[PDB]
Symmetry: D2
């Protein structure tokens, strides 16, 4: 679905910013809580999940292991 890495990265980055925009709208409108299926569209829940999706997609393309990264952050957290 993408061969040239920078175009894949650029696409997912545009999508991340689009979902952050939709997240801003959902939070502004107070669409909090845990929706059922019928309530999911435009909920804060859906938009947070959508941002997460693109964070994970960007990690994949950038060769980032989020679990290892978390591990390192925890090491520093404990120092501090």
């Amino acid at each position: 679905e993408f061969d040239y890495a920078p175009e894949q990265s650029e696409h997912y980055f545009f999508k991340l910013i689009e979902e952050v925009g939709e997240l801003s709208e959902s939070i502004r409108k107070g669409k909090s809580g845990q929706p059922t299926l019928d309530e999911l569209k435009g909920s804060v829940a859906e938009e947070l999940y959508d941002v997460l999706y693109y964070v994970c997609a960007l990690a994949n393309i950038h060769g980032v292991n989020l679990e290892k990264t978390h591990e390192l952050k925890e090491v520093l957290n404990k120092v501090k």
Copy 2:
């Protein structure tokens, strides 16, 4: 680390439900730092000395605030994921 476990661990450490704007501001701050790390091409998986400013760090920091905001807003990300799995299959 399971998603629900990360969300729960973040809640134990950092949960200020009366400070919802704090978390939103921080999310946008981290998204900006992420933009910088991508522009500068700081990709790959860093060792501890390379961590600061890396794409890896900034992605993790965005993730942290997504989870912290989920806790603030009464969202179960793992359950929301399950729900999204259903819709995207339609």
Copy 3:
């Protein structure tokens, strides 16, 4: 709005919403200068919308963008 923080928070949410819509417009390559009929969803419209909220935030935060420009102009001339 009477209470300034709520005004600021509203405009900041709107700014982020418009930056998202801008990202979509650029991704889709909706460049150029639209006619009235092509305006909706154009890069032009989203840039203007982002600008609107920048100016709205300047107002609420007591920022003079003309004066700020003048100051930046100076510093830039040393770079």
Copy 4:
């Protein structure tokens, strides 16, 4: 400073049409710095020694990239403003 004059002055100084992503990354970087300045309450109109990290600086920096992107994408902001002004009075 007219909006059209600001846009054209920025074009004179900084116009790299083959670097469209540069400008978009920078816009998002400035929006994040704006978020920080607002969270920290760095409001008002700063003097020169107060400028760095101020809400004023970050708002100007976002404005700069909005104008720079307009140049990149063939957008006339003043004309766009006029078109939006037309629609706003209608509804």
